[PDB]
Amino acid sequence: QAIYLKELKQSIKDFTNQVSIFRRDYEKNGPMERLRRF
């Protein structure tokens, strides 16, 4: 868990990037195969 703490800090930063990519994808769909892939 002391290792998982270091892993968590990496995960939370990877997580905030995944949420921003998800919000961009929902914007792309809002702008078919592309909507299904979105």
How is 5-30 classified by DSSP, letter by letter?
HHHHHHHHHHHHHHHHHHHHHHHHH-
How far CA 13 is from CA of 8, 16, 24, 28, in Å, comes to 9, 5, 17, 23
- Is the Cβ–Cβ distance between 7 and 1 less than 8 Å? no
| Tokens 């270091």 sit on residue | 6
Q: Are 38 and 26 in contact (CB under 8 A)?
A: yes
Resolution in A: 8.0
